[PDB]
């Protein structure tokens, strides 16, 4: 049973107080003590906090827990920009008789200037029509923050079918990066007269519209 | 130095089995206790099993019960984890962990993990080594900001993961963009790679894109060439 349910987000500017809590039952922290994990995403995680409130030496004086009953708390006490790294409580379950992991909190740190898209959109390749096939790729680059939307149309009608859209990534351009991969017939293609990627990005839209008969 | 360091198993069939090792170093092994914890791509750590020091008892996650087994050669100095019955929710990152503690976690008391080591990646899918295909992206004449022009290559429908897409026998570098590929639908994959250059380069220069998908042994080079529509890149300089 995992309930460790922790906040999946939190911001905060450099230098601040930022809390992280986390509220499990009287079984896994009502009974054993919290641990908190570091965790670069995908990437081997590291002991941040023991014994509720512990630090393992080597961890910056500025990182405090606390327990509290059936529930326990991770305070960041001077908010650097390192510290966007993923956040896991956990606690040893004497119910379950298992290690109850959380559900993670990722520290975003809120400086950094609005990137915008930089959407760039390929047509079906002729070989590609050739094999029986249409393919619409839909690229979109140095954005930031990581939070796009990507919106298929076509003449002037939004379009979901075969649109298989990648989730924003993380390009060491320290922005954000996605693809979109809307799938047709080589028949439905040239049914229309134009479609677009329109991709919205903190308000603002961007298309780019692209045309089966280019020559023509 | 702690040293722990997973050996095991990548893409397997749902069904199939795998046997990840972990072999430590920097400590007395026989005196902490062992975790195997994983983590499915994009969501959190998962807790899967823990064995005492002595291997005198062990716990597994509901989940994984039954199928899994925590195994260790206090001997040898390695922690096992025997994964029968492979389904395809089984996917992730499987870490090797210590419990710092006095080599157990119980009522009283639970360390935790202090150490952890790496990960090993192992895939469970329903789904079988496909070559890519791939259909070069060519160059438009629209007229794009001034930002010039971009073109590229369609690696689609490809398995496993990775695919190596150097541009023109890698002499091309840092116009260059290769995309993180998108798990599709099919259970297979697609990238792509997108050379942005200057739309006056484009038609003196000869933009090749060398693909290579190892695992199915795939070498495909594409010529990347525009439009005949272009007649201000296809024509002769006049």
């Known amino acids: 049973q995992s309930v460790l349910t922790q906040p999946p987000s939190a911001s905060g500017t450099p230098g601040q107080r930022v809390t992280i809590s986390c509220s499990g039952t009287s079984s896994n922290i009502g009974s054993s003590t919290v641990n908190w994990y570091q965790q670069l995403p995908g990437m081997a995680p590291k002991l941040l906090i023991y014994?509720?409130?512990m630090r393992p030496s080597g961890v910056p004086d500025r990182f405090s827990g606390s327990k509290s009953g059936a529930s326990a708390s991770l305070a960041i006490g001077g908010l650097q920009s390192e510290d966007e790294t993923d956040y896991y409580c956990?606690?040893?379950?004497?119910?379950?008789?298992?290690?109850?992991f959380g559900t993670g909190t990722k520290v975003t740190v809120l400086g950094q200037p609005k990137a915008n898209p930089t959407v760039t959109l390929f047509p079906p390749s002729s070989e590609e029509l050739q094999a029986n096939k249409a393919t619409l790729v839909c690229l979109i680059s140095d954005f930031y923050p990581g939070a796009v939307t990507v919106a298929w149309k076509a003449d002037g009608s939004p379009v979901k079918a075969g649109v298989e859209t990648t989730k924003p990534s993380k390009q060491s351009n320290n922005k954000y990066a996605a693809s979109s991969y809307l799938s047709l017939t080589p028949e439905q293609w040239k049914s229309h007269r134009s479609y677009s990627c329109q991709v919205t990005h903190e308000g603002s839209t961007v298309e780019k519209t692209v045309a089966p008969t280019e020559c023509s | 130095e702690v040293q722990l360091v997973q050996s095991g198993g990548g893409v397997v069939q749902p069904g199939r089995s795998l046997r990840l090792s972990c072999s430590s170093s920097?400590?007395?092994?026989?005196?902490?206790?062992m975790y195997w914890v994983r983590q499915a791509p994009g969501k959190g750590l998962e807790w899967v099993a823990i064995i005492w020091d002595d291997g005198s008892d062990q716990h597994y996650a509901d989940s994984v019960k039954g199928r899994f087994t925590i195994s260790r050669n206090d001997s040898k100095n390695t922690l096992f984890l025997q994964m029968d019955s492979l389904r395809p929710e089984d996917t992730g990152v499987y870490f090797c962990?210590?419990?710092?503690?006095?080599?157990?976690?119980?009522?009283?008391?639970?360390?935790?993990?202090?150490?952890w080591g790496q990960g090993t990646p192992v895939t469970v899918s329903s789904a079988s080594t496909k070559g890519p295909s791939v259909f070069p992206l060519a160059p438009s004449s629209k007229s794009t900001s001034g930002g010039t022009a971009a073109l590229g290559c369609l690696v689609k429908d490809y398995f496993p993961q990775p695919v190596t897409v150097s541009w023109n026998s890698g002499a091309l570098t840092s116009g260059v963009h290769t995309f993180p590929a998108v798990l599709q639908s099919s259970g297979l994959y697609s990238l792509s790679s997108v050379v942005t250059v200057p739309s006056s380069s484009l038609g003196t220069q000869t933009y090749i894109c060398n693909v290579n998908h190892k695992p199915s042994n795939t070498k495909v080079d594409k010529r990347v060439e525009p439009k005949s529509c272009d007649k201000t890149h296809t024509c002769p300089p006049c």
């Open positions: 956990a606690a040893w379950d004497v119910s379950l008789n298992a290690y109850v």
């Open positions: 920097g400590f007395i092994f026989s005196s902490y206790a």
């Open positions: 014994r509720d409130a």
């Open positions: 962990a210590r419990d710092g503690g006095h080599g157990f976690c119980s009522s009283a008391s639970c360390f935790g993990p202090d150490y």
